[PDB]
Amino acid sequence: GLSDGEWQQVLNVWGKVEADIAGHGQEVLIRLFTGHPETLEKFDKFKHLKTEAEMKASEDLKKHGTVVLTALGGILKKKAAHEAELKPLAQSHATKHKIPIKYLEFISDAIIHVLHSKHPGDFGADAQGAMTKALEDFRNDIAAKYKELGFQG
Amino acid sequence: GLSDGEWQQVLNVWGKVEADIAGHGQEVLIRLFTGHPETLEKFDKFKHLKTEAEMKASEDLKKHGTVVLTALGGILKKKAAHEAELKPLAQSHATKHKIPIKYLEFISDAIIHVLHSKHPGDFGADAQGAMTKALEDFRNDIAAKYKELGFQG
Ligand code: HEM
Ligand code: HEM
């Protein structure tokens, strides 16, 4: 995992990518295609380009580079946002409060019960199965942080 | 992993919690502490509480319930938001484009190469490490989705 400061450095450099996304995206693809020509075969639109100059002249290759970097940027920013909330919680519950994963399962069962008790008409079998999976996914994400911290839990 | 529909059902029900977060949080904690008394022992501030009246009478237990549910709902929403961007990308790259994890490694390395190249002043060893990890974290996130979709990446 990244630390808090590492995620902030990822976000800072992506701000620089976005100030010239077309140039960055073009350069990334050319670098991939020249360094690893077998990749270029996946692109039915691009595989006729034989030289770096030909690649640089393609408005379509440039447009696809912008699509890739925009998609990646968005995923990185959403990961960073989730990590900035998950990491402080894992940190405190591993090192200060020393909470086993099993106890997070017990509280997840209590949440599911309270939601079902309070909102039966909004919390049928499908909704309940979805929430059970979301809280298991949450525990799994905390468990991965506990591991990085060496807390067995 | 949850499907998009499952994430939407989670966020739909969480809307109901938000309407009375403190009441939900009080009920969740009392359910937890009554079902699993060893969890109450982890709270130095609450472990003296012996009866349900005493637990309902506690100003701080109720405030803590709202803290806990507020923090979980923010993590769930941020996880859903990340999944809503990552899942479509993994689905197309697994099923339509059929891109191996190793090609995702090649593009990761191209991005780090181009960032190093176009920002000579800025992108030093630490920042480059942070991006390396962030792209491996991304490849790992895709690889987990690939598994779910039964695509060998
Ligand atoms: C950082 C990694 C990557 C990101 C963010 C990314 C993103 C995207 C996006 C947003 C699209 C258009 C929508 C879609 O079909 O999902 C796309 C299409 C595509 N991607 Fe990727 N991609 C990545 C890596 C790769 C790699 C390494 C390859 C091949 C070696 C690949 C091959 C393709 C192909 C063949 C298409 C369809 C192109 C077309 O005909 O229009 N991608 N990618
Ligand atoms: C859905 C799962 C949980 C969430 C979202 C959650 C969230 C929080 C929050 C936001 C705080 C205050 C900030 C902090 O210290 O990190 C906190 C404190 C605490 N949590 Fe949790 N928690 C969870 C589960 C548990 C469980 C299962 C236990 C124990 C059985 C636990 C024991 C504690 C303790 C002892 C504190 C310090 C409380 C104080 O004295 O004020 N947590 N938790």
Swiss-Prot record, chains A, B:
CDD domains: Mb (cd08926). Monomeric. Monomeric heme protein which primary function is to store oxygen and facilitate its diffusion within muscle tissues. Reversibly binds oxygen through a pentacoordinated heme iron and enables its timely and efficient release as needed during periods of heightened demand. Depending on the oxidative conditions of tissues and cells, and in addition to its ability to bind oxygen, it also has a nitrite reductase activity whereby it regulates the production of bioactive nitric oxide. O2 binds at residue 64. This is Myoglobin. GO terms for cellular component: sarcoplasm. One of its GO terms (molecular function) is nitrite reductase activity. The modification Phosphoserine is found at residue 3. One of its GO terms (biological process) is oxygen transport. It is found in: Cytoplasm, Sarcoplasm. It comes from Equus caballus (Horse). Its main location: cytoplasm. Nitrite binds at residue 64. Heme b binds at residue 93. Belongs to the globin family. Keywords: Cytoplasm, Heme, Iron, Metal-binding, Muscle protein, Oxidoreductase, Oxygen transport, Phosphoprotein, Transport. Residues 1-147 form the Globin domain. It holds the Pfam family Globin. It catalyses: Fe(III)-heme b-[protein] + nitric oxide + H2O = Fe(II)-heme b-[protein] + nitrite + 2 H(+); H2O2 + AH2 = A + 2 H2O. Its EC number is 1.7.-.-, 1.11.1.-. The keyword Glycosyltransferase does not apply.
